[model samples]
Target chain A: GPLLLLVFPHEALLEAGPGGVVSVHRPTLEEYLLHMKRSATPTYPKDASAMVTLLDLAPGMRVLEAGTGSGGLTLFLARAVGEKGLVESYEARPHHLAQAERNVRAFWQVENVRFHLGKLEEAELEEAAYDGVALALMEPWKVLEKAALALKPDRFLVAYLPNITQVLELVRAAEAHPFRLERVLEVGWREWEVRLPVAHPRFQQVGHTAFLVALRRWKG
Target chain B: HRPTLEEYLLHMKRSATPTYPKDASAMVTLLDLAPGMRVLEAGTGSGGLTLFLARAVGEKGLVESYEARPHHLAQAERNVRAFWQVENVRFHLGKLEEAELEEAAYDGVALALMEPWKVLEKAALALKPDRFLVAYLPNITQVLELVRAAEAHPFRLERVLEVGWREWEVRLPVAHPRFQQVGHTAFLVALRRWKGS
Candidate 1:
């Protein structure tokens, strides 16, 4: 007997069940789910894109990324920095580090990144060496002193904190040190709907989650 | 509560009514504008937000707006005048970055607001210590540069909030797919002058 199937563009393919699967060109939904499962921490929010854009990354710039969760942003930095540049990432959890290494390798960016199995404080790096440093963690202020030691004067130091409490604390902590507070911003993106016969506009959109505070080490 | 689009347009077009576009409303609310509250605004672009601020600080309160470009200044002046609220607003035809602001004068200041990094020093000196210094920065990079510059001495950032909005479609049978999203406007950073300094 032959079977008939109907596909709708806007309809969900699967019904309510324990688990279901669908296949597509780009990374399959299942694969993405699996990758997410491997992540030790929640993925950095979309605002990280603004942080990356603010970095003004270019080829041959040695960059350091702390908190390599799921290696999503590390891959972005790797692409930006290219072959001449290097991205050294730190993840304390060995399992998460392994997952990130695998993810980077899958994206053929393994050669561009060096995964370290240590926290930001424990990771020993040369002073004033890296051209850019990105920290996405729970307590960025806890590592601000080290960031001050590791980053060059006037170099970029970007930190992604989840809430206002962390944002305020980080700013206050940086003020006491030689580092100058650059900016604390959040990225909000809006998308419009396009259709035939009826296309006017959309409503209020996605906002908040993760306030990014950027600071630069200044020579006093 | 449910005015048709045509009626809304007509009502908005009336001379007595004040109208503001959707984009500028965020700036208006962020300024914490209130009636009879003196407000200072720099960089009057298209007078979209200027009108909002003018109405916010009503009759008793004064609004001093600075615009460098003659063309923009003319447009803003005309808009404010057309609204017949000229008495409430004062336009300064000069560069905001170079303009000299009165010291410790304004009750509140709203930069509506863009790239305020260049004028942090001036803002710190011009407004009262307790008054709010609201700067609308574009991205994280500009935010850092402005804060770093201000951290040197006079201006100190007291609070920062990134306001965002998300929309969901409400339907009868089934409701779940979020068809629209608005992300990343500007980071609203507020600062207060350090009293001792």
Candidate 2:
């Protein structure tokens, strides 16, 4: 069969056997996640990775994640909390959950995660259980109580909101729900070709992912 | 309402280049700054980042900020206090390369000036082992040399990143990015000091 003609019709199929055409250098997992089909605006690695870094999630720690948006950061969470750790993600949208489940299993082969297909209100979460909790919802502040219930005392609860309004509400509500303000910040990630003399930021980028609100669940 | 960093950011006296909150926040995390840690800061232009480092280190820590230009130092010192009464910062009025930096002393360093490559030798020797050197650079030539310097001696190239931020005036139903290219902050490079042998 002339599969080469089918796959890389315009592309120069320099090498191809098992995986798709190899016209370009092997793309990283960060690269592959961008190509996965998305039913919603996927979480960019910048915001996703920032949560992992800022929250200080490490290997062998358990984390609770919300809004499993396209598994963009799900994979990163899994990576940060390695095999020794656990990443439990929840998705309310059925279709989005299906896609996330597929990507998490196929691309990442992450075995340490337990994917939940329900809302936080209905889910039974244990008290003082997790090291970190990461959220990607429009009104994540709604779960400040539930998140605090499961999160360790003085640990982190991070929210990824696309606009300042969401972050503002979260900050205010977090104070009411009783969380310490760690920091509310955003991340911009860029890469350069580094040919030596002059270099510029890559023309393409995930312009605006989300504003990160890092909060500590303070119970006192 | 708790004071927002953006409020101070907006009010900071602007006589020179200013570091964005996004970049400063990320740098604080990347450098892993914490309370009671001593920090070294170079080119305290406008005192934007100086304020950030001071806040992260809090009352328990100390920040010694250096500037080659005397005028910038004065402006930075005023701006640092004007934004908030941050009393922990000590301003050194001179070039970082010639400034008297202690050996194996600082927990971290943030370079806000050009020609950071010139001070790599001093930074490497003075930084505590496995400490970080984070800097802002616009051109790639300096990054090339900086990375090479890290690779050559008792340090390792850790990460390079740049931050972009744009705000949208929320309308309803959906929100779209405010049309345009937001200002480009300098590319950030991070390195960790280590013993090669």
Candidate 3:
């Protein structure tokens, strides 16, 4: 939890060592995320938080997550599920998965997640096994068939797609699957800059993080 | 047990066009509300957003809501009491300018009025330094007026945005965004109070 601050003249060390001279408090999820290892653009906390709400996640629920890039969203999902729940995160790339696992482990010591080193398509998931599912893939539509099968009836599946084209593609593919599109929304979070006599919206804002498409598993 | 704000908003009775849950939730985040933090509200439309602010601040906190129209205030009061069943919100049948407000007391202030710029004087007096004051305006023209008016006040223009939620209908073999959707609701303008030089 401790961090090193290098001053211009001297370095300030806030070390987390055994019986250390100095101590630093834990970083909030947002602060920790600012410094996370990024193999890909990690899901910003804004979108991730919105997705967690869209999924209607609750404690002790089993959640399926794909696109565990640096595990940013994974940690958010983990927090929503709480101690009694489990998060089974799947990733296709080994390097990305390894980095995500490391980043997650470094922040979270709790044993609530299981990492899978493969794609959601290749994984043999149980039918109607998960309470919720979240996908942050380039081709989330490609896995909707399996995702539909894995999700319980009336449960939610949230997809984080970047472009309007990707969103359209995913929606079009949902017609053939057992998933019903619920809502397509883009979460916006604009922070303010305050310097006493000066206050305004930050010059560079997080305009479009991603478009979240929420779907529900149709009753079979 | 408390239901999620979305669930409550969906089920609550409405007279005036209440602030939708999506926008209300965003406003809550923008204001950075917490338990036991007091908030001020004007334009109690259907008491929809009143419920959100009430829940965010918990029962220990308070929301002093003002509505100019008696009918609107009565409806909002009824709607809020029907669903929330809380003593946290106090409904006042008057404009925010006429209502007596304590100096630098409220944690945050939310305005859903048409002419929010006119209330800047009272808002500046009622809000603490560095606290946020948000405006929910239905048009960009109104947002511009409010922003321009804020220049003379102790408030700093923070941000202006329109929260959007596009719903889709997925009836197997025919999936698409809902044909008829409420496209625009209102633009949210957030301003932080600062010490005047």
| Model 2 / residue B172 / CA error / Å | 6.1
**Which sequence of candidate numbers ranks them by DockQ, best first?**
2, 1, 3
Q: How well is each residue in A1-220 modelled by candidate 2, as lDDT tens digits?
A: 1222222133344455435555334446666666666776677766777889977999999989888567777888998998769988988988888988877776676488888998876689889989999888888977888998899989998888877777777888887776899997867665555565767665345456678899887775
lDDT of 3: 0.82
Show where candidate 3 strays beyond 4 Å: A2-25, B1-197
Alpha-carbon deviation at B66 in model 3, angstroms = 43
* Candidate order, lDDT descending: 3, 2, 1
Worst 10 residues of 3 chain A by lDDT: A4-13
Clashing pairs in 3: none
Task: Give iRMSD, candidate 1.
Answer: 13.2
lDDT of 3 by residue, A55-116 (tens): 99999999999975888999999999979698999999999989888888877878899899
Q: A77, model 3: CA deviation in Å?
A: 0.8
TM-score of chain B for predicted candidate 3: 0.89
Considering only chain A, what is the TM-score of each predicted structure? 0.78, 0.84, 0.90
Show model 1 residue runs off by greater than 4 Å. Answer: A1-45, A200-204, B1-197
Q: Which ten residues in a row have the lowest lDDT in candidate 3 chain B?
A: B173-182
Quote each prediction's TM-score.
Answer: 0.47, 0.52, 0.52
Q: What does chain B score (TM) in every candidate?
A: 0.76, 0.89, 0.89
DockQ per candidate, 2 decimals: 0.10, 0.11, 0.02
